């Protein structure tokens, strides 16, 4: 039922994003046959879990999941104890912990809080990874919101061992809410997905994690700029088109003067 | 391609 899959995907893209989890759970009860497939395509806000061994917050994903268990990135242990599990590797585990430290530093510098989690797995002559960041707006100020970002990177290591190719796909789910005296209540949800490829020289001075972090921060800055400027100023333009602060008589007079100006310009060419 | 090879390996044996 691929047509019904496209139907469900379009409907979920159309519904409000704050109730994405509840409405997705409800929709699963309608056509369960595609539900897991839907869960593979639909992007959901992340969940936080307590790694008690180290005492850390770690993010639950579909890449660290193994059945009905989620692997922590710090303890390297499943929250439900699994007698059999898929650890990444020995070398990729050191890459994972290095990435976890680096992205903890990045999250602290750019977000000042939230939670982060980097999960790596091997790949055909290379390795893939997922970097998850969550950041719930603090309750000190009237602004309350949430930021989720999932960046899946695929690293194809060239045979020479010095060059590699990175393919980054990032999804950002943003939600903001403000209750001010003038605006009363504003609630800006949104989601945005982007992608890009690059190739970089792996070296001791420029290891894998440096390249992945550079790509991730560049994508995060680009997505933040686009969301702030294009995808929010378009909503500003729409709200300005739905109602006019200035009266229409004055607008008509200004437009008549403008018509005079453009015809005069057209005459003199 | 090791994961791909193992899936083919099961098919080749059967």
């Amino acid at each position: 039922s691929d047509q019904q899959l496209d139907c469900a995907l379009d409907l979920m893209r159309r519904l409000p994003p704050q109730q994405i989890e509840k409405n997705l759970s409800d929709l699963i009860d309608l056509v369960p046959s595609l539900c897991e497939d839907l869960l593979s395509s639909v992007d959901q806000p992340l969940k936080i879990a307590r790694d008690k061994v180290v005492g850390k917050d770690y993010l639950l994903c579909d890449y660290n999941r193994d059945g009905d268990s989620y692997r922590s990135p710090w303890s390297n242990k499943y929250d439900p104890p699994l007698e059999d599990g898929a650890m990444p590797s020995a070398r990729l585990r050191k890459l994972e912990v290095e990435a976890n430290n680096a992205f903890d530093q990045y999250r602290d510098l750019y977000f000042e809080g939230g939670v982060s989690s980097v999960y790596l797995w091997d790949l055909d002559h290379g390795f893939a990874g997922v970097i998850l960041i969550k950041k719930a707006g603090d309750g000190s100020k009237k602004i309350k919101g949430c930021w989720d970002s999932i960046h899946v990177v695929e690293v194809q290591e060239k045979s020479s061992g010095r060059t590699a190719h990175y393919k980054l796909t990032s999804t950002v789910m943003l939600w903001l809410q403000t209750n001010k005296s003038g605006s009363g209540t504003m609630n800006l949800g949104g989601s945005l997905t982007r992608q890009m490829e690059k190739d970089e020289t792996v070296s001791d001075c420029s290891p894998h994690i440096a390249n992945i972090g550079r790509l991730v921060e560049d994508m995060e800055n680009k997505i933040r700029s686009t969301l702030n400027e294009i995808y929010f100023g378009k909503t500003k333009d729409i709200v300005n088109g739905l109602r006019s602060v200035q009266t229409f008589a004055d607008k008509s007079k200004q437009e008549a003067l403008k018509n005079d100006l453009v015809e005069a310009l057209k005459r003199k060419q | 391609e090791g994961v791909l090879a193992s899936f083919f390996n099961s098919l080749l044996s059967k």
């Binding site: 409907l11 409000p16 003038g182 995808y231 709200v239 739905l242 | -």
Partner: protein, 278 residues
């Protein structure tokens, strides 16, 4: 398994929350998922009723060109709505959003002076300010107290441009000789989905007082209050958008770090955080 009552309940839940200007494909999707129109329709009638009720959809009367707004206040219950412009009772098909059988309905007309003065001044105002600006004014007896309700609605749909938007402002105003009360609710819903997705949902509640001396004077004062409230609200929204990147958005992710320089990934990887000393 899923009970059919739960199925149509979820269908109503999805229908009533559809964004403005996209209900038709939401309906297409929900039938395509259900594969049961007959099973759907009984509760879908209530769902479509509520959606078209709270969204203040405008429907055109071909023989009158009044273009009245569908509102909970002007509801009769025989799937009929009373347009107060010329006092026309008409059936409204929610499925097609169509007006049928324009039938005069005899109202006593005790409030017709206030209702018509408010309607005239409010039409003059909405045509002055709004782009499309479909509006209606109703009179009612809430708890035995006479009240005038102004309804303004302005919609702009461009699925070709991937964006829909709807403004809807309701304003109750009670009649009282010494001092009358005005209570307004303003809602804005904007969706924009070109290579992405954004959903603005804004709500405002306003309370004011007026003095009732003359119907024309009171209506003019009312429209001036509408002017001040909506102008300040829209300018506040514009200012809130202006201060998004600086303060509001900064609570989630900063444009640059506090150091105001891009992260030196080699530095953080090779060297520790450097906060070992304290």
């Amino acid at each position: 398994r899923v009970s059919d009552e739960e199925k149509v309940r979820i269908a109503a839940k999805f229908i009533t929350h559809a964004p403005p200007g996209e209900f038709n494909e939401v309906f297409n999707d929900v039938r395509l998922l259900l594969n049961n129109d007959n099973l759907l329709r009984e509760g879908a009638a209530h769902a479509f009723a509520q959606y078209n009720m709270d969204q203040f959809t405008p429907v055109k009367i071909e023989g009158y060109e009044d273009q009245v707004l569908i509102t909970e206040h002007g509801d009769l219950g025989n799937s009929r709505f009373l347009d107060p412009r010329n006092k026309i009772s008409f059936k409204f098909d929610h499925l097609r959003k169509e007006a049928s059988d324009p039938q005069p309905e005899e109202v006593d007309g005790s409030l017709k002076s206030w209702r018509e003065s408010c309607d005239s001044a409010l039409r003059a105002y909405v045509k002055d300010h709004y782009s499309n600006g479909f509006c209606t004014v109703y009179a009612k007896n809430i708890d035995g107290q006479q009240t005038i309700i102004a309804c303004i609605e302005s919609h702009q749909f461009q699925p070709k441009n991937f964006w829909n938007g709807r403004w809807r402002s309701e304003w109750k105003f009670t009649i009282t000789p010494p001092t009358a009360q005005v209570v307004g609710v303003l809602k804005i819903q904007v969706h924009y989905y070109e290579d992405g997705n954004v959903q603005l949902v804004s709500h405002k509640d306003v309370q004011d007082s007026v003095t009732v001396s003359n119907e024309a004077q009171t209506a003019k004062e009312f429209i001036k209050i509408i002017e001040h409230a909506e102008n300040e609200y829209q300018t506040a929204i514009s200012e809130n958008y202006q201060t998004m990147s600086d303060t509001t958005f900064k609570a989630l992710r900063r444009q640059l770090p506090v150091t105001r320089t891009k992260i030196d990934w080699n530095k953080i990887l090779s060297y520790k955080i450097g906060k070992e000393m304290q």
